[PDB]
Curated annotation (Swiss-Prot), chain A:
Belongs to the universal ribosomal protein uS15 family. GO terms for molecular function: rRNA binding; structural constituent of ribosome. This is Small ribosomal subunit protein uS15. It comes from Thermus thermophilus (strain ATCC 27634 / DSM 579 / HB8). It comes from the Bacteria.
UniProtKB/Swiss-Prot annotation, chain B:
GO terms for cellular component: ribonucleoprotein complex; ribosome. Part of the 30S ribosomal subunit. Forms a tight heterodimer with protein bS6, also interacts with protein uS11. Binds to the C-terminus of IF3 and to the central section of Era. One of its GO terms (biological process) is translation. One of its GO terms (molecular function) is structural constituent of ribosome. Keywords: Ribonucleoprotein, Ribosomal protein, RNA-binding, rRNA-binding. Belongs to the bacterial ribosomal protein bS18 family. It comes from the Bacteria. This is Small ribosomal subunit protein bS18. The gene is rpsR. Located on the back of the platform of the 30S subunit where it stabilizes the close packing of several RNA helices of the 16S rRNA. Forms part of the Shine-Dalgarno cleft in the 70S ribosome, where it probably interacts with the Shine-Dalgarno helix.
Swiss-Prot record, chain C:
InterPro entries: Ribosomal_bS6, Ribosomal_bS6_CS, Ribosomal_bS6_sf, Ribosomal_S6_plastid/chlpt, Transl_elong_EF1B/ribsomal_bS6. The keyword Metal-binding does not apply. The gene is rpsF. Located on the outer edge of the platform on the body of the 30S subunit. PROSITE patterns: RIBOSOMAL_S6. Belongs to the bacterial ribosomal protein bS6 family. This is Small ribosomal subunit protein bS6. GO terms for biological process: translation. Keywords: Ribonucleoprotein, Ribosomal protein, RNA-binding, rRNA-binding. Pfam families: Ribosomal_S6.
UniProtKB/Swiss-Prot annotation, chain D:
The gene is rpsK. One of its GO terms (cellular component) is ribosome. The lineage of its organism: Bacteria, Thermotogati, Deinococcota, Deinococci, Thermales. PROSITE patterns: RIBOSOMAL_S11. NCBIfam families: PRK05309.1, uS11_bact. This is Small ribosomal subunit protein uS11.
Length: 87, 70, 101, 116
RNA sequence: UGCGCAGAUACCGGGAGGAACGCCGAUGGCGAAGGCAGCCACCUGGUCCACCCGUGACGCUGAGGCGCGAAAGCGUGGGGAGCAAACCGGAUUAGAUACCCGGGUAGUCCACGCCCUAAACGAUGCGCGCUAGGUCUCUGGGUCUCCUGGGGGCCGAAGCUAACGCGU
């Protein structure tokens, strides 16, 4: 799965400042990593539909946060997209 | 009639290799005693069942036995 | 890497030449899958509750190993190959849940 | 022509008939009887009196081979399942032990529509 | 009817093969619904509790769309023990195109692709706020006769209801 070793490495990469665990940037990154872990898990296991629901909901939560970032500060939104390579 | 947990020590419910204690939870046949007769909690019965079933695969606990009566 | 317990029951008819071989065979397979061994309990001859391979008894081995998780099934498959090997059950180690404490 | 003098007696009790087999200790049969072996033909075979006589017919046949000690094995629910046993105890054959070995599946085979 | 002297039924040993998981098992648990029970490992979703740390309204519902969707049924290839539409028989009967009995093909299982229905039921759409309690229970936390969450039941305040009933 995803160990806390890899987890902190993503948070500390996207934290707006030391000690920041909840920024929209941190959340979108953490979501992104579970997206790829699941989407690579669904490359094979094409018949696992129950888990496939979690991925739909994950993708929704990511777009909602990105739609929020776009509204408030459109410069950081481009930075977060270009650093994660989405859209 | 006494219940199994009542007359017993402090034992590991997750140890599938201790037959002397696990044998106590099987009946005259190889079946697992219900919670009424084991005195175990809901969670304790769920744990005992899988560990009993584990020992059944190692050959330590019987799948079924023969009743000498009637 | 997680910590697993390897249970092995083999044919309890083996002399020392065959028993040592089957055991060192298990050793070589653990090395090839990178299983670091922590402790071991050899119970030996035991009365089985039902005949396994027509044989009423079995010779028991128990290993506590820490090994890569993705290699578990390939290790189990490698153990069940030998003929004298009869049962192979690999279990993820757990906390010793007490009862009647 | 055998003189086993001890062995096992199997009782197979169904609702349509009861039949008894008598074997040597390793399980090979010696003599046997049923509700049809005695005169009964139809649903009378499933009666306990038929099970009584079938047990005694098989018991007397085992006497000819010298049977004295008997271990009893019972398989199946049915009328005269018990009446077959009580006939064995007083047949003159000493009943060593009685065991119920009736095969019960772990839900492996779909039963006939009758049993669902 | 059928099976049995070509030796069945019953009994012991050996072997093959397929399907389903007894006890545990619960009035229980999990999931959005369909639905999910041997055991082991790996991959993986959801969910709940404590801390009060971070973000700072980022929320709700949702026409279309998209994905999922018991059984049965369809296509291709496998598989086929037991059950078994159709069908072949035996009885019953006034008749039996049925209930009962002996057989038995599709199918039921696997893979890949369709099909999109149901009493798919809580016959009760989703989210949030408010309004007496008592009791049984699953699962967390707690200074652990108890207090406090999150589920699953039963009685029942106020109230609602045509009535049955519903009732944190
Ligand atoms: Mg082998
Ligand atoms: Mg009859
Ligand atoms: Mg004939
Ligand atoms: Mg013929
Ligand atoms: Mg046989
Ligand atoms: Mg075959
Ligand atoms: Mg039950
Ligand atoms: Mg639910
Ligand atoms: Mg349902
Ligand atoms: Mg899991
Ligand atoms: Mg999980
Ligand atoms: Mg705060
Ligand atoms: Mg602030
Ligand atoms: Mg929604
Ligand atoms: Mg829609
Ligand atoms: Mg579709
Ligand atoms: Mg369908
Ligand atoms: Mg289907
Ligand atoms: Mg088909
Ligand atoms: Mg049939
Ligand atoms: Mg039929
Ligand atoms: Mg007809
Ligand atoms: Mg006719
Ligand atoms: Mg009529
Ligand atoms: Mg529709
Ligand atoms: Mg409404
Ligand atoms: Mg507590
Ligand atoms: Mg509640
Ligand atoms: Mg009520
Ligand atoms: Mg009122």
């Amino acid at each position: 799965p995803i160990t806390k070793e890899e987890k902190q490495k993503v948070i500390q990469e996207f934290a707006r400042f030391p000690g920041d665990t909840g920024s929209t940037e941190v959340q979108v990154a953490l979501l992104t990593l579970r997206i790829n872990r699941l989407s690579e898990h669904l490359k094979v296991h094409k018949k696992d539909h129950h888990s496939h629901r979690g991925l739909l909901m994950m993708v929704g939560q990511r777009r909602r946060l990105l739609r929020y970032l776009q509204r408030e500060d459109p410069e950081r939104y481009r930075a977060l997209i270009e650093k994660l390579g989405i859209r | 009639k006494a219940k199994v947990k009542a007359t017993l020590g402090e034992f590991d419910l997750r140890d599938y290799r201790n037959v002397e204690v696990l044998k106590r939870f099987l009946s005259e046949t190889g079946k697992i005693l219900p919670r009424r007769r084991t005195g175990l909690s809901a969670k304790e019965q769920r744990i005992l069942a899988k560990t009993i079933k584990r020992a059944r695969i190692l050959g330590l606990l019987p799948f079924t036995e023969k009743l000498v009566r009637k | 890497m997680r910590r697993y317990e390897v249970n092995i029951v083999l044919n309890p008819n083996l002399d020392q030449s065959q028993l040592a071989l089957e055991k060192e065979i298990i050793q070589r397979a653990l090395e090839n899958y990178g299983a670091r061994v922590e402790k071991v309990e050899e119970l030996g001859l035991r009365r089985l509750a039902y005949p396994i391979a027509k044989d009423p008894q079995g010779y028991f081995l128990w290993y506590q190993v820490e090994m890569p998780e993705d290699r578990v099934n390939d290790l189990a498959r490698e153990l069940r190959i030998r003929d004298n090997v009869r049962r192979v059950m690999v279990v993820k180690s757990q906390e010793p849940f007490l009862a009647n404490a | 022509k055998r003189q086993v003098a001890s062995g096992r007696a199997y009782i197979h009790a169904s609702y349509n008939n009861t039949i008894v087999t008598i074997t040597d200790p390793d399980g090979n049969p010696i003599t046997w009887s049923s509700g049809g072996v005695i005169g009964y033909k139809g649903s009378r075979k499933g009666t306990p009196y038929a099970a009584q006589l079938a047990a005694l017919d098989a018991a007397k046949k085992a006497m000819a081979y010298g049977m004295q000690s008997v271990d009893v094995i019972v398989r199946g629910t049915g009328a005269g399942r018990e009446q077959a046993i009580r006939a064995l105890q007083a047949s003159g054959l000493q009943v060593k032990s009685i065991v119920d070995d009736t095969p019960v599946p772990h839900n492996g085979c779909r039963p006939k529509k009758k049993f669902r």
